Design a protein around this ligand. Sequence first.
Ligand code: GTP
Ligand code: GTP
Ligand code: GDP
Ligand code: GDP
Lengths: 47, 428, 386, 22, 440, 434, 56
Amino acid sequence: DLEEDFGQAKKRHAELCRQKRIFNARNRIFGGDIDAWNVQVCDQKIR
Amino acid sequence: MREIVHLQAGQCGNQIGAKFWEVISDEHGIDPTGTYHGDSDLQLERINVYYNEATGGKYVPRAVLVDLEPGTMDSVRSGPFGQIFRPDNFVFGQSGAGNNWAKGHYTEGAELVDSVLDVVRKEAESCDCLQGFQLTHSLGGGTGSGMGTLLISKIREEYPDRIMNTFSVVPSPKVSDTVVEPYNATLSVHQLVENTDETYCIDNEALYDICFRTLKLTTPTYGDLNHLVSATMSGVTTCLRFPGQLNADLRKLAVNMVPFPRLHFFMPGFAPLTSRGSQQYRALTVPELTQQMFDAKNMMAACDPRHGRYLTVAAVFRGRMSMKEVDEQMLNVQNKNSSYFVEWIPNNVKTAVCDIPPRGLKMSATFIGNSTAIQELFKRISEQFTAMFRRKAFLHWYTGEGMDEMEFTEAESNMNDLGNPVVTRGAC
Amino acid sequence: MREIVHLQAGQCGNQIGAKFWEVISDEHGIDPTGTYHGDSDLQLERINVYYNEATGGKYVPRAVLVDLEPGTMDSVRSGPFGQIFRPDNFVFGQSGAGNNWAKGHYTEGAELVDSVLDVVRKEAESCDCLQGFQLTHSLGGGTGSGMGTLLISKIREEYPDRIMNTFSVVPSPKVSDTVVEPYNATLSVHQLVENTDETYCIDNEALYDICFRTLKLTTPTYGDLNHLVSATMSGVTTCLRFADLRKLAVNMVPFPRLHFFMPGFAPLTSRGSQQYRALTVPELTQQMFDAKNMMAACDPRHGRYLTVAAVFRIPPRGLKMSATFIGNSTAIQELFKRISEQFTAMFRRKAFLHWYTGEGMDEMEFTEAESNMNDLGNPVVTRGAC
Amino acid sequence: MKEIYTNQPTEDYFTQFNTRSR
Amino acid sequence: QRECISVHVGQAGVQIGNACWELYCLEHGIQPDGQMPSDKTIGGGDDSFNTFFSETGAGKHVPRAVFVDLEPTVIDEVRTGTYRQLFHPEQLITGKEDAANNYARGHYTIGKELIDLVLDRIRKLADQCTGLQGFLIFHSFGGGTGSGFTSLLMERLSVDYGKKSKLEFSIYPAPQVSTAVVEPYNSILTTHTTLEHSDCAFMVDNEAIYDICRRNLDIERPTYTNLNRLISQIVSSITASLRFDGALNVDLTEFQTNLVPYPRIHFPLATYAPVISAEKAYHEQLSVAEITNACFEPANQMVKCDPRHGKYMACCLLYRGDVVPKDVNAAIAAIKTKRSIQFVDWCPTGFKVGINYQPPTVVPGDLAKVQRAVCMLSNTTAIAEAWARLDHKFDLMYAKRAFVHWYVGEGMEEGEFSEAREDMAALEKDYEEVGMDSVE
Amino acid sequence: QRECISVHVGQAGVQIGNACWELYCLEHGIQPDGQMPSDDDSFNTFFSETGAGKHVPRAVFVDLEPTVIDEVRTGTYRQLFHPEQLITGKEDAANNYARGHYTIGKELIDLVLDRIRKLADQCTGLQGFLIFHSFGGGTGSGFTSLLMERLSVDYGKKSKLEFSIYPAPQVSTAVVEPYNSILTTHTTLEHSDCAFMVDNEAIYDICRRNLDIERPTYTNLNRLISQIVSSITASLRFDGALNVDLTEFQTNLVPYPRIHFPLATYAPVISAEKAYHEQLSVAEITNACFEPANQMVKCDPRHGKYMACCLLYRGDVVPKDVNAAIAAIKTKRSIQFVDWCPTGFKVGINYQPPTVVPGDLAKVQRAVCMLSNTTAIAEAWARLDHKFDLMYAKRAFVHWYVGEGMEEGEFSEAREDMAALEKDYEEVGMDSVE
Amino acid sequence: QDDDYSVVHRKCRSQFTDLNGSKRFGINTWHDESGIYANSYLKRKLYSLTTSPIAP
Ligand SMILES: Nc1nc2c(ncn2[C@@H]2O[C@H](COP(=O)(O)OP(=O)(O)OP(=O)(O)O)[C@@H](O)[C@H]2O)c(=O)[nH]1
Ligand SMILES: Nc1nc2c(ncn2[C@@H]2O[C@H](COP(=O)(O)OP(=O)(O)OP(=O)(O)O)[C@@H](O)[C@H]2O)c(=O)[nH]1
Ligand SMILES: Nc1nc2c(ncn2[C@@H]2O[C@H](COP(=O)(O)OP(=O)(O)O)[C@@H](O)[C@H]2O)c(=O)[nH]1
Ligand SMILES: Nc1nc2c(ncn2[C@@H]2O[C@H](COP(=O)(O)OP(=O)(O)O)[C@@H](O)[C@H]2O)c(=O)[nH]1
């Protein structure tokens, strides 16, 4: 019972997060993780 | 009293039924856990139509979930109204349809169809006076087409006096999500003709068309596209679930919209459909409902109804509203449009008015249109099938699963053999 | 009850009709939001001539707003009384007319006329007894010329006993904001003659004549000009809101070909001279009939007054006694003959027409248009000399 | 009778559009 | 929505685009990082960059331009200097060998190393573009790349993109100063090979901007930057009514249909007004009549051809700032009554008035802050003089065949010169029946 | 439930397997130890859960020569792979199909089949096999061919996907690669259900132009191949809108059984300090796949006929935008499909964006893998045919094969059926006239 | 001084064309079709000043 509750909570939270991500039209059509891109640029320069 | 057993097959049918049940559960008053918390008394008068009783005063859907892949069962269970279905009704197979009608009609679908027919018998015999069955599926692709049609054939053989309504998503001219959609649709239409009583052909291009211009949604998604079909289903099956004036159940709709037996390929519609930013500029009344309802941009099939004559028209209105106004409006539309209605079927619009509106509204309308214009769909799918069977490509799967080259010609000739009556009636 | 469907073609027609809906909303008591906020109960007595009802007492104009460029209709929405129209009435094209008659009459305009006829039928069905349509357009340029006259043709084909009031902005003698306006005007007066029932020629040179020599403005604007045009429109149509269209057309069009009208509006006083004004009926008549308040640049003294109307005014808000003139005279000969020479001068050397023949037109279209526009002339020279 | 013959859509109608990611 | 794609060919085109995109960045609000300041963007809703700048993620505003050159270092100042983060480096396209002032090396031999990649990048630019108003090709009639690669671009863009408009902003060779000696050869070849592909070609001369910067700007040592930014202002004014909103807007299709009488004649004269020099600009009030007189004065013309040796056909006037429309009607009345300005005998309503409300923006430099300006495009027969001078130059060269071995060795055949000269002579003949008055 | 077994053969197979399995481990969360720190089900398709939380990959690494397995058994993933999975011989195959298929294959085939049988026994529903190899070396040609011959008779109903490195049209690395390639395409034609082929020169061009790597290496190439294969087998790893299975991958590419050679392309191959300047919208990532420069072989699809296409979208992507991109593609005359497959697109969407290994590719929330079956592959076939014909005209290096044990006529017969495969390609690609 | 950024006259975001939704921030499940361009406030002011030329 508890494991099923944990699993259903995971699916519910993932569904809510994806709702908030794909119902945002601008970030969905064009967008990316700019912080991750900055970290990747720094890692490339370090290497 | 009357009952309709809900059957949903395939990915599209399962996710559309995963919606039809949420919408009607909010219509009746059932929470996600299953027991009733509503506001008015008459929601439980006819709740034993789509809901079977359970212990503790809770109600479960009378639904059978069919798929050949255990991937959408989990999504249905993890959805909002997921912990309401019978887990015994979650019948599924650990295999792959692979978008093949052959692997749904002549292979592992034909192995799982006995276990499916088991619970179909169970839910159809836990009754006293059944009215019929309601199968939601997609003609394009596997499982929903192949297993759906095999299920239709067996159920129609077993219970012939009961109706068989099929809400079916047909391939659209604009965008296709499967390259063997013409093969699946052509092999499924032949079984759909001489088995079912009421087919409802639905185009995803037309659904997105409504969502972009009528609804003016920013991001039309699949949940929304299934929700329009759910609203149409709940509008159609309303006079047998809530009281009204001039009630029309599904059998009276069948007898007044199927003139000759094979011509039953309807075009569904739903027309209290307004955008939020244009909500305050609208005047939703009887003329506005009929006006948007006969408007030929709200049809959920991409079969354009000004290129063909209407044979029969059904309008199931919801909300309590002026009967004389409805009758005058239905006379007015027939008088104004005289070239789009056949002369040998006079006064060819049927009217039902139920008193209880759907949630969020006061007045609503649901359209069922049997017209000559359905020939465009079958001519289009026939053109696709002839173009892709002319070289007989994409076909070694069917010959390996056990089909024959004569059967494809039989299905193509039967689709043209339905293209013939629908143009004889259009040309008198 | 009687109602009017207001369609407006082009940038020019869109701005004129926007100011028209502003002055009609001020005249009846509609705020820019749409809710009725007035003081007299007679304003809502016959409100269903220009405004369709909505939920919650929202009055929406019965207007179809067309333009082949998808930027003018955004400006119409951004205008002051912009949040009053239906959003689905804003039918548009994702292209440009580009001051071209063929690019409104035999191309994209003819591809979009289906949707506009859909919307116009959509408004005309939800009504009881339609008296006529009301198109505001520029006779020059594109959209108002090509798409506008194609619209008039299809509306005349579909609805045969409804009066077409087309307020057309004709080219000016003194000034010309385009170069192909003789081509557009000569190709559109042909469609105006046998289709429309009442053409109102309104000229910007005459409008500035009024706004400068009589109104004493220092920086007259396009909104000022369209306000004068819209006040003339409201004075024309006020009879069925507070001699209707049928009576005015019957009593003022003697022969079916000649119906081009001189408009005017004359309780008109400058701010420097308002406090010395003694507004009466003879003063209103003197301010009317004199050839300084004409709204089309062709002098009525040069011709003979065939027929004359006088709609005297519930007065418009902020005024005491108003007076609207609509007149058919033989002076309208000058308007056609001044641009016929422009058209034959620009056509004798066969220039500016490759971008009319490339869209699907032929050489004979211009010649036959010029021929029948000249044949418009003999009925307006014969009655000037019996 | 007019106040209920009119149909004003409420929030329970616009809250059913856009509810799932699929 | 109303986008236009800029292509800058050759060293001339690249530095033209440098000036133009500096003005676009400073006017449209975009920093030389690409990011717009939050105050400048009105609630994130100021779509008046969508005709030049395209939004990507991280707020970047990458331009809709391709800076093409056959030879290095000229793209390299752009991708090293203060605007290195604005342009996508794949927009900037560079070869490795110059055309060396050869139309043959710019069109036939070294054009194939970059023509496919430039067409692919133009496809990419047009992909994220719903309604393409037109292409703006900025180049010269001088250098070998600016002739040959421009001509090859016209051929490829006309084959692929036949329904889209093309405006050339070209540097015509000057009567006196010059920069090379094969300049008449390049000009005569590229005029024939771009005549049937250009929709409308505005030409700009060097000595006229020389005179304008020396006379109206009081500055005796400017450079190509001060010459070059005037072209930037002219393009900012021609595509202005589809950037901001005004009393009488006007589209790229409307410029063509009110400037181009016959298909061959598509060579207007660009003139700009208030080119005044700060400590010359507070002393006059600069009304609409004054700024129209500045354009119609035969000393502020920007091609060295005198309009009184010819007749105007069509003039497209474009006013920007606080301009009253019936004040400009009163001004054009006086312009029409003036007699030294003579029109053709077949275009009596020879004016198109366009009004934009947005005042001109001032970059840090030489030009003055003014609240009224006008760009006047005149399609006139006086440019036959500038044609015939280069016709004489080509005749003097081709009488005994100087520098022709370079042009014939790099792929081009001999008869190209003859057919280009015959087409030029036909165009010069065409001007005569255009200019002569009607007698029938 | 939805497991698949990976068989990596040869040096190319082993190093591509290293890149693939590091990508898989970073995708799900399995450490190089073999232990998920977080503590789902998605670790069934590639991993097997043995007790005390240990996750063993479902892979068999085979090479007839050591040290390419000993690098794995010494490096960071030595505790991840079960030591009986990694199988070595004692003699290098020496660029010899004869050595890989006839003499030194029989000392290892029984052990490899025993390991594969144990893996298939430790599976409920086996979706298929993924055989990673090259058309170069003797191991990757001959032992791969012999493996497919045994797997076809023992596991006939299961699915097989080949991931093979086809030789470069220009550069390559060996003098015997045309011989081995002609010998192996004929034995893997009838024994591979679908065969994706990638070309080192094309990945070189992609890395040098899109990734801004002036000196790309095999690590970058195999990481790109790892991203491609992970985008393929993703719908049967995580959940999405249109989940498409391995049998659907087999279905919506092949119109005919002999045409099972699609071309895979990847979208966002962008290089971090280029992603600030483009939108990477769904239309752009669909256009970049159809562009004839992001292809993973050096063939031009413009000189060809697109039979079918599968688009595999990962991340925040909407089927509205997918349909819009498909509609934008279906209007261009450059991408000219055949006239017997009008609906030539299959779509698949999963909700999982690609993970980022610390390296070259950029973090994007949108990707698509394109699997396109087209007639443009005949050029890449025929160039190696030309090389083989030039060498076999006077029988270079043939003595090594015929002294190792394989008959002389294999060359001619493989060449003949390759020419037959060509003739099938043009016979299918030509339009209908009757 | 050099310049004042005037926000009064520029074409704002199109409420009727380019309705993909990727031009307005935040989650917006309906298309913006209430006329309120982000230049309304800084223009309705000028309108207030505008005068009608009949009995001013
Ligand atoms: N705005 C502007 N115009 C320029 C500039 N430089 C040159 N021009 C014009 O360009 C003409 C000749 O230079 P180009 O055509 O650019 O020579 P090129 O493109 O380098 O040709 P190649 O030398 O063969 O590579 C000169 O006569 C100038 O009038 C500049 O920096 N800015
Ligand atoms: N990505 C990747 N490709 C490789 C690698 N090694 C080789 N290739 C490609 O594969 C081709 C032949 O390599 P292999 O077939 O793997 O050589 P092998 O398996 O060691 O064969 P033997 O030397 O006989 O043992 C070459 O042309 C390379 O282009 C690698 O390590 N990584
Ligand atoms: N309206 C609606 N249509 C859907 C949905 N999911 C899938 N579809 C349509 O169903 C088609 C394919 O489904 P199908 O192949 O029949 O699924 P299967 O029966 O499991 O094989 C696609 O073209 C989709 O457009 C949904 O949730 N709602
Ligand atoms: N009265 C009035 N006239 C206008 C207005 N706007 C433009 N015009 C006239 O319209 C003419 C040109 O407009 P036009 O090119 O026809 O616009 P189009 O119909 O969209 O092509 C000009 O000469 C103006 O005098 C306005 O708002 N009010």
